[PDB]
Amino acid sequence: VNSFSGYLKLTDNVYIKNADIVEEAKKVKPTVVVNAANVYLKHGGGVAGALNKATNNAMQVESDDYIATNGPLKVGGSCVLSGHNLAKHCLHVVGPNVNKGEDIQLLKSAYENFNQHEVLLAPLLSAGIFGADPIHSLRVCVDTVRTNVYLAVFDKNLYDKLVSSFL
Numbered sequence: 109v110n111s112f113s114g115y116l117k118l119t120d121n122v123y124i125k126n127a128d129i130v131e132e133a134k135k136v137k138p139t140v141v142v143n144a145a146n147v148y149l150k151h152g153g154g155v156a157g158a159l160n161k162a163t164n165n166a167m168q169v170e171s172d173d174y175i176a177t178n179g180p181l182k183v184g185g186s187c188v189l190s191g192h193n194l195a196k197h198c199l200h201v202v203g204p205n206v207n208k209g210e211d212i213q214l215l216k217s218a219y220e221n222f223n224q225h226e227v228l229l230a231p232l233l234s235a236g237i238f239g240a241d242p243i244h245s246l247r248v249c250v251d252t253v254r255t256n257v258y259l260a261v262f263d264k265n266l267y268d269k270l271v272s273s274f275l
């Protein structure tokens with residue numbers, strides 16, 4: 109049993125809810141919250157901007173030190189950093205950004221990072237400002253992640269379309 113409440117069960121291991129990932133993290137304090145990161149860990153907008161704002165910019169300060177030491181992530185890659193006030197850990201995962209022309213096949217590689225964690229609160233990778241089709245992102249998630257993933261979808265309209273269209 110875990111703390112997550114109000115989710116619809118899609119599969120054995122994948123759950124979904126219409127929720128603000130920031131407000132969900134604040135309530136649950138999950139072991140792992142996933143950030144929709146870019147390779148520079150520049151948390152300007154979308155999910156990353158919202159998570160970072162909720163940490164009062166402490167996520168960005170930590171991230172800048174990580175990049176200064178290690179250099180940029182790979183598209184499809186990840187790093188584990190602090191969850192600050194939101195979670196124990198933040199798994200920063202880089203899905204391909206269609207608005208930069210990145211290979212959508214890298215979305216499966218991105219989701220494979222989730223398998224290193226038994227339970228996660230996450231957004232749909234590569235959707236939102238990254239430009240991918242969220243329906244596709246959900247299919248790749250279900251067909252790739254084997255650990256228990258709780259997906260937060262902010263827009264009620266997209267949430268309802270993801271559920272209604274789910275095979």
Ligand SMILES: O=C(O)Cc1c(Cl)cccc1Cl
Pocket residue numbers: 144154155231232233234235236237242260261262263264266
């Ligand atoms: O949650 C939403 O409504 C839209 C959304 C964002 Cl903002 C970021 C990543 C994935 C998705 Cl699906």
